[PDB]
Amino acid sequence: MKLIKNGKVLQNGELQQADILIDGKVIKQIAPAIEPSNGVDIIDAKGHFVSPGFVDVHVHLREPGGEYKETIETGTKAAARGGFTTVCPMPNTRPVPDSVEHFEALQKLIDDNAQVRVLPYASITTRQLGKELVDFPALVKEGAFAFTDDGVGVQTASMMYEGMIEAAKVNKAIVAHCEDNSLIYGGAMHEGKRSKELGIPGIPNICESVQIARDVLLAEAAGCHYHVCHVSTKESVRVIRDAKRAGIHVTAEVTPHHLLLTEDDIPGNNAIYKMNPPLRSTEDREALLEGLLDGTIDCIATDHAPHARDEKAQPMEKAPFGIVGSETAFPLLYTHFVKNGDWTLQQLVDYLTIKPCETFNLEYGTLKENGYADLTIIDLDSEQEIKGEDFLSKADNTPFIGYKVYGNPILTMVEGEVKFEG
Ligand SMILES: [Ca+2]
Ligand SMILES: [Ca+2]
Ligand SMILES: [Cl-]
Ligand SMILES: [Cl-]
Ligand SMILES: [Zn+2]
């Protein structure tokens, strides 16, 4: 047994004093006060805010295949430091989780290494080559969270359609990185003012939106739950809004960097600012923010995308796409929108807990009695500077280094086991 003394919890739209008694994997009670019994491990929260653990539906753990970038150990250690207790890693690994053999090998690595709950995505097709559908019921039975189009995969509407029919059969989401291959044009950032100023090839908004517009109609015909990954363009948001209005089961996520930065924030040819989808225009960001606020975009997800230092030191035209984000997500968003803007702590917490869970019909995201002891303790009032030295991730490829932030996690617990202590 464990007891978290002195924390504050959210009730409606206010912080309130409450102690939390934990029995094994579950929490036994949440009470104004509670005296300890026998063999009680003590955690003193010291007045800090106690939140349900964050849930990240889009991370890259890199292992297997890319262990030098990140491992399941380092990646979930980074998640816990960011206050996340559940993450769902993408399938763009080697081997791809596209078979029972590969899923079982992965679950073993998770059992041995994961420091938080890991709900892995399956690919939609064998090796993500987009030529042959995986065995959907077989992967669901091995713990597949969703079936996901990441990388250069599904290349015809027919394959996406057939993939969606299979996911509808197993009551699982098709999750898609919307990117039309012929419309990438070798681009490395948003096609707009800045790409022209820097002489760097850009990616047009249409690369993303046209796939969303196709998939929502394929989803509607298949009767399946379609989820759009990290939305970046103003037109994508429109298409999702129109699709939801038509009664289609589409949901969508936005990343912290797309809420906070635009093409204008890119100081020069710097791959630290290179991710996919790219940081787009002020008009695009305004659309995303509007869409998250009116519910068109369901939740926030990080697209934590660790890469090695020498890789991200190269010019944008050569460097891989991606920035890390598990450790910086909440503090950045809390400081910008809550401490320094209109959002409430409750509103921010919901985008990271209950909303991801409602989207995928998950049981987590709440701080309730009988729920798992999935918690993070966060220091709301002290300022910390974001430094690569502090990252538990193996990587430090992020434009947020140097930012001064409030709302920093100091302790994360997964099923009653302290998994991070700052
Ligand atoms: Ca050029
Ligand atoms: Ca590190
Ligand atoms: Cl959780
Ligand atoms: Cl795929
Ligand atoms: Zn991604």
Tell me the CATH number at 34. Answer: 2.30.40.10
Helix (H, G, I), strand (E, B) or coil at 291: helix
Residue 288, H or E segment: helix 282-294
Q: Are 320 and 306 in contact (CB under 8 A)?
A: no
**Interval between CA 130 and ligand 3 midpoint (Å):** 32
Domain end residue (candidates: 317, 337, 365) = 365
Which protein residues have a CB closer than 5 Å to ligand 5 (ion)? 303
Shared domain check, 58 and 47: no
d(CA 133, CA 122): 11
**Interval between CA 107 and ligand 3 midpoint (Å):** 18
Residue 254, H or E segment: strand 250-254
The number of the ligand nearest the C-alpha atom of 125 reads 4
Shared domain check, 152 and 296: yes
Tally: H helices and E strands in the chain: 13, 23
Shared domain check, 376 and 232: no
Q: What sign results for the dihedral spanned by CA atoms 123, 86, 77, 380?
A: positive
Shared domain check, 40 and 20: yes
Q: Which domain holds residue 378?
A: 2-52+366-422
Experimental method: X-ray
Shared domain check, 311 and 290: yes
**Cis bond upstream, residue 64 (ω within 30):** yes
Tallying the residues shown for the chain, one arrives at 422
Shared domain check, 350 and 280: yes
Shared domain check, 219 and 148: yes
Residue 239, H or E segment: helix 234-245
d(CA 234, CA 287): 5
* Residues flagged as binding site: 58, 60-62, 92, 150, 177, 230, 276, 303, 307, 321-322
The number of the ligand nearest the C-alpha atom of 390 reads 2
Shared domain check, 405 and 261: no
* CATH number of the CATH domain containing 231: 3.20.20.140
Find, among 330, 331, 333, 311, the residue nearest to 397 by Cα. 311
Find, among 306, 299, 348, the residue nearest to 327 by Cα. 306
Shared domain check, 352 and 216: yes
d(CA 253, CA 362): 16
**Interval between CA 99 and ligand 4 midpoint (Å):** 12
Residue 41 burial class via C-beta count within 10 angstroms: exposed 0-12, middle 13-18, buried 19 and up: exposed
Shared domain check, 302 and 154: yes
Q: Are 352 and 299 in contact (CB under 8 A)?
A: yes
247: which DSSP letter? T
Domain count for the chain, please give it.
Answer: 2
Domain end residue (candidates: 319, 347, 365) = 365
* Residues flagged as binding site for Zn(2+): 58, 60, 150, 177, 230, 303
Which protein residues have a CB closer than 5 Å to ligand 1 (ion)? 199
The number of the ligand nearest the C-alpha atom of 230 reads 5
Alpha-carbon distances, residue 58 vs 218, 344, 352, 368, 418 (angstroms): 22, 24, 12, 25, 23
Find, among 365, 360, 123, the residue nearest to 226 by Cα. 360
Shared domain check, 189 and 105: yes
**Interval between CA 303 and ligand 2 midpoint (Å):** 18
Helix (H, G, I), strand (E, B) or coil at 364: coil
Task: Return the amino acid letter for 417.
Answer: E
Catalytic site residues?
303
Shared domain check, 45 and 83: no
Domain end residue (candidates: 365, 381, 402) = 365
